[PDB]
A paper describes a structure:
In most cells, the detoxification of sulfite by oxidation to sulfate (Equation 1) is catalyzed by sulfite oxidizing enzymes (SOEs).
In the SorT/SorU complex, the SorU protein docks within a pocket adjacent to the SorT active site, with the heme cofactor located at the protein-protein interface. The SorT/SorU complex interface shows significant charge complementarity, with the negative charge on SorU correlating with a concentration of positive charges at the SorU binding site on SorT. In addition to the electrostatic interactions that support the formation of the SorT/SorU complex, there are six hydrogen bonds found at the SorT/SorU protein-protein interface, as well as a salt bridge between the SorT active site residue Arg 78 and a propionate group of the SorU heme moiety. A surface loop on SorU (residues 82–93) moves away from the SorT/SorU complex interface, leading to a reorientation of the heme ligand residue Met 87 so that a different Met 87 rotamer coordinates the iron in the SorU structures within and outside of the complex. Within the SorT/SorU complex, the SorU protein shows a significantly increased average atomic temperature factor (reflecting significant flexibility) relative to the structure of the SorT protomer (1.5 versus 0.9 Å2, respectively).
Author numbering:
A (entry chain A): 37 to 399
B (entry chain B): 29 to 111
The structure:
Amino acid sequence: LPDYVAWKDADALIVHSDKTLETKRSEFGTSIITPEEKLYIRNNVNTPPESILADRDGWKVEISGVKEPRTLTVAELKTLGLVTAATVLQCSGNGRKYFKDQLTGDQKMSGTPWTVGAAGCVIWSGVPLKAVVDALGGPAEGARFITGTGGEELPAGLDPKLLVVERSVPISNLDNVILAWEMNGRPLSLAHGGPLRMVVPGYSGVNNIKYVKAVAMTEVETDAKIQKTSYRVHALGEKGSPDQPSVWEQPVKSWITTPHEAAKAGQVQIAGVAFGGMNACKSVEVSVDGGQTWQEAEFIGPDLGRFAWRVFALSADLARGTYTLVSRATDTEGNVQPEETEMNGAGYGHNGWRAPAVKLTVA
Amino acid sequence: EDKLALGREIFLERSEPQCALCHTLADAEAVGEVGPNLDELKPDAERVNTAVTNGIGPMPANEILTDEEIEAVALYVSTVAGK
Ligand code: HEC
Ligand code: MSS
């Protein structure tokens, strides 16, 4: 494992690269919450040093686009409010392997071949952005986005807007947005963007700015590369452009996580995780024969809110053989996972129920 | 056998921006820390080639570089990654 994540669980993680660590499917557990030392890692650029955690409460955050712009410290943010929320953190790339599986002939695609482990469910704690904005007089008239900026010190000798991690989402999110300083009951880790993190519930990982150093209410999206042309949904062979949809709201998804490989004939408890992105998951069906037959599954554990995943489970009674385990989720507004997700050039947002099927040898 | 040194030139000098500025590759004494350390990625030639052609994140779709060059850099990287 790489040093800045030396504390993580080497056995629980696939090391695609030093910037890129995926959780093994067997490691999610059945508690909803993803063990911090097993949560995935995805970094677009270089990583800050530990020294920025020396003084967590002195970390500064420039808040502009409000009737009273100010730089605030984490110390002051702690005074303004408190909020806690469970959300699913999941990269837009999660599932890219499954898009690569469908490429025919010359068709080629780059990116980390994530399967399902670039996703976790965590409990964030910190101050809500609405509180922080109302503290500062409200947002400037005609603000249309929340725009946050990563704190990484960019290496000299390249154009900042090519590498800065600066994302914009709609101001309709203000009510849900959180500047968290705490994850799963602990001071936020360096790996996961401590000492402070913009958290945009229901949205892809890219929008949750690690080490956020500025947060602006803007009339326009940021022109940073990472917003203008990256993280955009386009057809194969197209280039990304700001008229295309960006990776914002997460769509309804689920996968099977247990059993992952082998099982004795008889009763077998099949479980996994499901969520509706911006909406709560309403129901889930499981199939053991890879689509031909569906049964309604059961929710397991408590409901941590609309942006969290549920654990579900099915008790099946199985004869010896090779099964094909798949899950299909419906959210509260009636959106179902498709069998397979329409292709896109970059490979974002895979949410098909067939691709991530588990193969189970019942012996 | 010969087209390697071309890839290495492409990697350290000829590319705009230079790969070494973003990437770490032991063989090239490159220590770029923005994109993946390529020794850890240990990518095949096909992976390199597609990345540089199609673009990925801050790498844009290639436009100022010909194919003999791309394949050269794809050959060099894939070969030396983690030697
Ligand atoms: C800074 C502008 C960079 C330049 C110059 C080069 N690379 Fe790059 N590269 C960079 C980043 C931040 C990433 C990761 C992006 C992501 O979304 O994961 C990459 C990625 C690659 C890869 C992996 C491709 C894949 O399929 O995942 C390769 C093989 C690669 N880069 C090669 C490469 C070459 C050959 C370059 C010179 C022609 C080059 N990169 C320049 C950042 C930057
Ligand atoms: N600052 C910053 N932030 C940030 C980054 C970087 O690189 N930087 N990344 C992204 C992404 S992109 Mo895709 O959509 S996913 C993601 C996430 C992840 O997280 P973790 O690592 O903690 O897991 O984050 C986010 N944020």
